[PDB]
Structure 1
Amino acid sequence: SREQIIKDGGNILVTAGAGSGKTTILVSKIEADLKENKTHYSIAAVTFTNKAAKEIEGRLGYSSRGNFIGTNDGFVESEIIRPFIKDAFGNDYPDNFTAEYFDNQFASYDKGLQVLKYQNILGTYSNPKKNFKFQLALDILKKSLVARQYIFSKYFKIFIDEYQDSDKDMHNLFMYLKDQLKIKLFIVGDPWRGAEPENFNGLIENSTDFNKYHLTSNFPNATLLKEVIKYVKIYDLAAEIVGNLSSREIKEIQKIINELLNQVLINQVLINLFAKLDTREITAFTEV
């Protein structure tokens, strides 16, 4: 149910099914906490989908509290990486770089860290098992005292959804926030490229202090094929894909999409789009 989780103020684990109630329970809990808390502290809402952040933000409405509603990748950049990169790693490192997921991939953290200073763009990890950005954000927090002070003094609770898609390294940063930075966590999981269901599924059994709640249902890549199909009938398409797409990257993507709008050329376009980031899905695209 919804009443008892509203009363609870500690760490809350929600096991909503099919995502029907995830966004609804997120908005309700956020409003309840914001109206109850009269202090200067604010909340941060992080979503894998950029569109999911936008629809959530629209439901809270205008507010000057300073709350953060955005993507998981956009949270670390805006709140941890951008302001405190120079303090943690000296003035040489830049704070005006740009994150590009498709280009400039590296193989090792040390190589990824060493290219970062000279490249002046936020690089990405070629391997899908690890996320370099969240390792860098975690490293910044440990190194920088002011970064630790700011995070504690800014946020009192963090709202996370789609936690079963969270990477193991991404899980590592959040548990850093919860354990010594003493920040309440409201994470939602359901039974992303480097998705690690292991960390979320094992979290329920490993930790007993966390509170778990399972709401009733009523009260994998086919999504993006439907989105390009409806677009054929581009910025909205960007919100569906996880992360924040660069202008250069989306212009290249849009060039491929307008090339789509015969069956043979349809299949080749879907192949390269998948390469940039199933035999049944291509047939469905051919049908529509």
Structure 2
Amino acid sequence: MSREQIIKDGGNILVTAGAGSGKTTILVSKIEADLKENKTHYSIAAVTFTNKAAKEIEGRLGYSSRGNFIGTNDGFVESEIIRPFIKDAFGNDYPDNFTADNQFASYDKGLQVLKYQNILGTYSNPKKNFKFQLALDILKKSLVARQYIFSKYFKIFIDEYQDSDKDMHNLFMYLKDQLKIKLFIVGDPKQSIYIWRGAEPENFNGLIENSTDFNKYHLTS
């Protein structure tokens, strides 16, 4: 079946797989194949939505001294973009300390909380994201941030793309286009029950029905 046409493909890929297809198995197989094939210094990043899937993938992959990021997409920005390069973009007064109640409905108040209160902000409206817009803002203001992101990873694995806001799409597409980093997207179109958290199913469907540089496969197993 098509499960052998994926491991042999290197580049941008989609996998439109429904429930019970075995997304985790193919994701782990592709990750292991990519790591075994490549002999350079580059790494991979696997971004999920829950800590359970992150820990499952961490356990399945094993142990290595190569630095690969496995975790949630909210931890990705905090660990890679915001915490290291916040002061290089805005200034030395902006703090890199935070332990995240104090949500608001404006972007400026988020920076105000992060600076004065010294705690990561949030939003009251679930249709807008503060983390993934601040991350993209930092990426466009810091040259060393973009340099590190380009020098670090050669592929990023994304799962459950249907439950993604517009800011997540913006950041991922910025990475794909402006920084020339490959993407591996897996998602079920009919699993948008998380729409109560601001999920936008239109992004995955638009990618499926309009993307020209994406290779598309479907799994019925």
TM-score, normalization: structure 1?
A: 0.72
1:122: Cα distance to partner? 0.8
Helix, strand or coil: the match of 1:209? Answer: coil
The 8 Å contact of residues 12 and 187 in structure 1, kept in 2 or not, is answered as: yes
More helix by share: 1
Distance 1:87 1:15, change over 3 A: same
Q: Tell me how far apart the structure 2 counterparts of residues 193 and 20 of structure 1 sit (CA, whole Å).
A: 25
Q: Tell me how far apart the structure 2 counterparts of residues 19 and 10 of structure 1 sit (CA, whole Å).
A: 25
**Identity across the alignment (%):** 100
Q: Tell me how far apart the structure 2 counterparts of residues 203 and 17 of structure 1 sit (CA, whole Å).
A: 17
Query: Residues 120-199 of structure 1 correspond to what in structure 2 (within 5 A)?
Result: 120-191=118-189, 193-199=197-203
CA RMSD of superposed structures (Å): 1.1
Helix, strand or coil: the match of 1:143? Answer: coil
Larger radius of gyration: 1
1:157: Cα distance to partner? 0.3
Relative contact order higher in (CA < 8 Å, ≥ 6 apart): 2
1:19: Cα distance to partner? 5.2
The 8 Å contact of residues 15 and 186 in structure 2, kept in 1 or not, is answered as: yes
1:89: Cα distance to partner? 1.4
The 8 Å contact of residues 17 and 23 in structure 2, kept in 1 or not, is answered as: yes
The 8 Å contact of residues 19 and 190 in structure 1, kept in 2 or not, is answered as: no
Distance 1:19 1:176, change over 3 A: farther
* Greater mean alpha carbon deviation, residues 33-42 or residues 192-201: 192-201
1:201: Cα distance to partner? 1.0
Helix, strand or coil: the match of 1:44? Answer: strand
Helix, strand or coil: the match of 2:46? Answer: strand
More strand by share: 2
> What are structure 1's unaligned runs of at least 5 residues?
218-288
Q: Tell me how far apart the structure 2 counterparts of residues 27 and 54 of structure 1 sit (CA, whole Å).
A: 12
Helix, strand or coil: the match of 1:84? Answer: helix
Helix, strand or coil: the match of 1:151? Answer: helix
The 8 Å contact of residues 113 and 119 in structure 2, kept in 1 or not, is answered as: no
List 4+ stretches of structure 1 deviating above 3 A: none
Q: Tell me how far apart the structure 2 counterparts of residues 139 and 22 of structure 1 sit (CA, whole Å).
A: 32
TM-score, normalization: structure 2?
A: 0.94
Q: Tell me how far apart the structure 2 counterparts of residues 136 and 35 of structure 1 sit (CA, whole Å).
A: 34
Helix, strand or coil: the match of 1:43? Answer: strand
